[PDB]
Design a protein around this ligand. Structure first.
Ligand SMILES: N[C@@H](CC(=O)O)C(=O)O
Ligand code: NA
Ligand code: NA
Ligand code: NA
Length: 419
């Protein structure tokens, strides 16, 4: 006998790939019947979006309140240093692989500052209740006048920053704020038993979410016409996730880095099918502390920050595809043009959201920094549901890897706290 959570997810990926392929050659469903066929996949998607509001709020508060305000200053320093030393590696390895393969040659025919100041405008929102379901976006229009309105989508960057300050303030209050530690420890425990309820619906939801995703129009543009560009994204996503990311784990932890990746198989295959790192963040919490036994004082702090900051698969896909877009023209892309690609792609992966297809929002930022037009992204929009699924597994794995690396780097400080 074995565990039924992972063996039924693998059985639902197989039964969902073989369903969304067979119904195309056999039948011809209309545009309205292809939306009701993926309806159990939509219910799973909005059941996971539902739970990230009490999960991020309660884990960010009790993750920092359990540390005595100077241990948390070094867990926070060893997290941002790790996130910068993997994003830059995933950018550089995607830069080297895209100018040596050269996928874009002889196949051509076939508001950056306003987007970066919206990261700081979203870290300090004007309302806490409005930050739970609405984001702030700035447009420039008329000699121009800056005017911003409130769009939709949960402001995850503003709830992390406020609960980090709320977590530090509560932990320094002592006995005067002990009832707020017990409230958000009982809330983080109650909204992890709900994740174990959604995890029983997940094989039935994936089986229709991935069958209604490969049910699309043309399998020829993804395969051969835009071919050998996906052989630079998936190649860079392979070497970074199989070789490089279990080499950063093996250097600082001598504890078998593929035993950690095998123990995170539920969170890896969830993001491989739902294509959103923020929505699978409840799966990453459960599949790390229960399987790999990484300490709860670190995963409550490292994993929510890494889900919206550390996005290595997006950082490699930004550095590969923006050069490939410039390679469809006859641009030289000299030594000055390479480094400015590698700089804004590090910031675009930071500014990218954990929503599905957030990959093409921040592609305008890196493309306009090199001089390419924004409407030259329309060549990439065709195959984006498949390249978004492999760059979310890597993003999730990177976050999972961080929990184990920061824990061995701070084994003394966790053992410092005693009775
Ligand atoms: N939802 C995707 C967005 C992206 O491509 O960055 C992810 O988290 O990986
Ligand atoms: Na990173
Ligand atoms: Na991430
Ligand atoms: Na990000």
């Amino acid at each position: 006998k074995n565990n039924w959570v992972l063996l039924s997810t693998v059985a639902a990926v197989v039964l969902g790939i073989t369903t969304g392929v067979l119904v195309r050659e056999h039948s011809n469903l209309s545009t309205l019947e292809k939306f009701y066929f993926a309806f159990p996949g939509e219910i799973l998607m909005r059941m996971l979006k539902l739970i990230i509001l009490p999960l991020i709020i309660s884990s960010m508060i009790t993750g920092v309140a359990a540390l005595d305000s100077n241990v948390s200053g070094k867990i926070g320093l060893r997290a941002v240093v790790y996130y910068f030393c993997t994003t830059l590696i995933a950018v550089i390895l995607g830069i080297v692989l895209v100018v040596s393969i050269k996928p874009g040659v002889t196949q051509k025919v076939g508001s950056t500052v306003d987007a970066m100041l919206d990261l700081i405008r979203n870290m300090f929102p004007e309302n806490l209740v409005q930050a739970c379901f609405q984001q702030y976006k700035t447009k420039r229009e008329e000699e121009y006048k800056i005017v911003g309105m409130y769009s939709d989508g949960i402001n995850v960057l503003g709830l992390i920053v406020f609960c980090l300050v709320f977590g530090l303030v509560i932990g320094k209050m002592g006995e005067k704020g002990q009832i707020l530690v017990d409230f958000f420890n009982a809330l983080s425990d109650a909204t992890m038993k709900i994740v174990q309820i959604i995890m029983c619906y997940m094989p039935l939801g994936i089986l229709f979410l991935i069958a209604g995703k490969i049910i699309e129009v043309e399998d020829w543009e993804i395969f051969r016409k835009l071919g050998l560009y996906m052989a630079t994204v998936l190649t860079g996503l392979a070497i970074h996730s199989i070789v490089i990311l279990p080499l950063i784990y093996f250097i600082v932890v001598r504890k078998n880095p593929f035993r950690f990746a095998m123990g995170m198989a539920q969170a890896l295959l969830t993001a491989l099918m739902i294509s959103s790192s923020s929505a699978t963040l409840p799966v990453t919490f459960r599949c790390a502390e229960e399987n790999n036994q990484v300490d709860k004082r670190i995963t409550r702090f490292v994993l929510p920050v890494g889900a919206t900051i550390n996005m290595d698969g997006t950082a490699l896909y930004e550095a590969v595809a923006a050069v490939f877009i410039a390679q469809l023209n006859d641009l030289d892309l000299g030594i000055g043009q390479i480094i400015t690609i590698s700089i804004t792609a590090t910031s675009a992966s930071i500014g990218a959201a954990g929503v599905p297809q957030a990959g093409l929002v921040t592609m305008v930022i890196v493309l306009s920094a090199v001089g390419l037009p924004a409407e030259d992204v329309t060549l990439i929009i065709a195959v984006d549901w498949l390249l978004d699924r492999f760059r979310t597994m890597v993003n999730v794995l990177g976050d999972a890897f961080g929990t184990g690396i920061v824990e061995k780097l701070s084994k003394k400080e966790l053992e410092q706290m005693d009775v």
